Design an enzyme around this catalytic site. Structure first.
Site, mmCIF file in Angstrom:
data_model
loop_
_atom_site.group_PDB
_atom_site.id
_atom_site.type_symbol
_atom_site.label_atom_id
_atom_site.label_comp_id
_atom_site.label_asym_id
_atom_site.label_seq_id
_atom_site.Cartn_x
_atom_site.Cartn_y
_atom_site.Cartn_z
ATOM 1 N N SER A 15 40.883 40.709 33.024
ATOM 2 C CA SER A 15 39.885 41.620 33.589
ATOM 3 C C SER A 15 40.252 43.055 33.220
ATOM 4 O O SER A 15 39.444 43.786 32.652
ATOM 5 C CB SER A 15 39.791 41.441 35.112
ATOM 6 O OG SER A 15 38.704 42.181 35.659
ATOM 7 N N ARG A 38 41.114 49.905 38.514
ATOM 8 C CA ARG A 38 40.968 48.958 39.606
ATOM 9 C C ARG A 38 39.604 49.144 40.278
ATOM 10 O O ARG A 38 39.014 48.175 40.736
ATOM 11 C CB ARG A 38 42.119 49.059 40.620
ATOM 12 C CG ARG A 38 42.413 47.675 41.242
ATOM 13 C CD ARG A 38 43.524 47.696 42.281
ATOM 14 N NE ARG A 38 43.824 46.316 42.684
ATOM 15 C CZ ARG A 38 44.757 45.548 42.111
ATOM 16 N NH1 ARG A 38 45.533 46.018 41.138
ATOM 17 N NH2 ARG A 38 44.931 44.303 42.541
ATOM 18 N N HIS A 41 37.080 47.366 38.109
ATOM 19 C CA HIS A 41 37.325 45.941 38.348
ATOM 20 C C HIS A 41 36.585 45.507 39.625
ATOM 21 O O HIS A 41 35.839 44.528 39.616
ATOM 22 C CB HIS A 41 38.837 45.722 38.445
ATOM 23 C CG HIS A 41 39.242 44.382 38.966
ATOM 24 N ND1 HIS A 41 39.319 43.258 38.166
ATOM 25 C CD2 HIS A 41 39.626 43.995 40.204
ATOM 26 C CE1 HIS A 41 39.731 42.234 38.896
ATOM 27 N NE2 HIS A 41 39.932 42.656 40.134
#
Ligand SMILES: C/C1=C2N=C(/C=C3\N[C@H]([C@@H](C)C4=N[C@H]([C@H](CC(=O)O)[C@@]4(C)CCC(=O)O)[C@]4(C)N=C1[C@@H](CCC(=O)O)[C@]4(C)CC(=O)O)[C@H](CCC(=O)O)C3(C)C)[C@@H](CCC(=O)O)[C@]/2(C)CC(=O)O
Ligand SMILES: C/C1=C2N=C(/C=C3\N[C@H]([C@@H](C)C4=N[C@H]([C@H](CC(=O)O)[C@@]4(C)CCC(=O)O)[C@]4(C)N=C1[C@@H](CCC(=O)O)[C@]4(C)CC(=O)O)[C@H](CCC(=O)O)C3(C)C)[C@@H](CCC(=O)O)[C@]/2(C)CC(=O)O
Lengths: 208, 208
Positions: A15, A38, A41
């Site tokens: 990812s 993040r 994500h």
């Protein structure tokens, strides 16, 4: 049967590698870049990074507060329950006062939302805290007003990412202008619990 | 001080009115439209509606299940803790088995994620449930495999909105193709806890 990848450690690695291959991340410092990755994500949204703004040194300051044991003050349970306890570096308290039984009456007396009134109960934990506001623009606006009083305890950092159509963009723009303590925002209507939790989880632990 | 709107009831009304003024909602039935509006609201993202797909009659079927007391089975605490208990029509249980102490060992034995392994514990509550998967594509894929066994209890509806770069789009496309029970998805990488909770909250209560 349906075939799919089942190794969670691998899924993460893939990812983040997909995000770094697609996203426009050059302007961020190394400490900021990890946070932005993040956030992308969590949102499933390459392009989010075009809206992210950090006060200089915020990412460094927030990680340092967390490593020093700072509590994390959360506007909603979707934020507090999100935070990965295994990633916390110093047994950090994760706090949300929204459901405290005194909040409904306090909100009525204050002529404000329950989200905003609940921040009054943060006072004893606010000094040096990391604030994580992922939902309520009224909580962010109210926090800015609280911090206009020099007697109010002051947090180490504010993750100011409320989402929405009414007041959200304004609350975050106001945070950046006021610059009360080091901050990160998602400019505009985008934001939310997942992006906010991702920011906390990124800053909590040096391992992706 | 900072000025801002503090009436939460008003904020909602204004938010939904802004969304309806901007969004492209004509193709949705009245029952679907209410769900889509709340999803947009949660995401802060006009344009989300271009990615939403419903099985015919899903919105009707899911509301009916909830009004009949169906439990809501959630892949993560960010979903379960999101659901507005005040909006639930029939004292509906909101369940998340992810943190059950048996899940880590079960995941290891299954060679799967904790998110997916936890769904095994849903079996006693699965028949006629409303499933709310907002995070884990492996949970959605695993559910599809569970339902390939005619002995498995079958839910009334699946809100299949996991988010992400690895497996998310695939898991939701597979749900739509398999058509195991009435479903809603966000096609592609977008999704998440907030959109999923919004869908549940929309279907739970006839009042916006
Ligand atoms: C569930 C939930 C959700 N909200 C979302 C987003 C928004 N909603 C705001 C207004 C509508 C609002 N929402 C209530 C406030 C209740 C309150 O504090 O009095 C207040 C009424 C007021 C807060 C405020 O405006 O500052 C609260 C905070 N939202 C909750 C409960 C969180 C409870 C908790 O965490 O413990 C809440 C406390 C209501 C409740 O359930 O009691 C925003 C206002 C801006 C706008 O409307 O455009 C904005 C869009 C941010 C989605 C989540 C987004 C995410 O997590 O990322 C969603 C899931 C959507 C939904 O209602 O289904
Ligand atoms: C916190 C958290 C978050 N995840 C998000 C999104 C993703 N992450 C997935 C993979 C990376 C993954 N994530 C772990 C799984 C842990 C597990 O189940 O073993 C597994 C490792 C595996 C799940 C799976 O892939 O199906 C779990 C589910 N994510 C959690 C915990 C939820 C715990 C709970 O709710 O009780 C979790 C159980 C880890 C933990 O904390 O223990 C996805 C995979 C797809 C991808 O990576 O591109 C996807 C992107 C969806 C953000 C939330 C999104 C939202 O709420 O909307 C964020 C907040 C991001 C972050 O880590 O900070």
């Amino acid at each position: 049967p349906h075939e799919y990848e089942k190794d969670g450690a691998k899924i993460y690695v893939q990812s983040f590698a997909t995000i770094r291959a697609e996203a426009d991340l050059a302007r961020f410092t190394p400490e900021e870049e990890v946070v932005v990755v993040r956030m992308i994500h969590a949102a499933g949204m390459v392009g989010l990074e075009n809206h992210v703004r950090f006060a200089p040194g915020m990412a460094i300051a927030a990680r340092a507060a967390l490593e020093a044991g700072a509590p994390i003050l959360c506007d909603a349970r979707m934020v507090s329950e999100g935070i990965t306890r295994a990633r916390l570096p110093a047994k950090n308290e994760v706090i949300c006062t929204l459901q405290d039984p005194r909040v409904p009456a306090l909100a009525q007396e204050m002529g404000n939302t329950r989200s905003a009134a609940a921040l009054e109960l943060w006072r004893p934990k606010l000094e040096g805290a990391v604030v994580a506001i992922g939902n309520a623009p009224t909580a962010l606006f109210h926090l800015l007003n609280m911090l206009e009083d020099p007697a109010c305890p002051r947090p180490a950092a504010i993750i100011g990412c409320p989402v929405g159509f009414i007041g959200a963009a304004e609350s975050k723009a106001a945070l950046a202008v006021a610059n009360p303590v080091p901050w990160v925002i998602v400019e505009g209507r985008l934001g939310g619990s997942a992006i906010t939790v991702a920011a906390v989880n990124a800053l909590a632990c040096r391992k992706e």
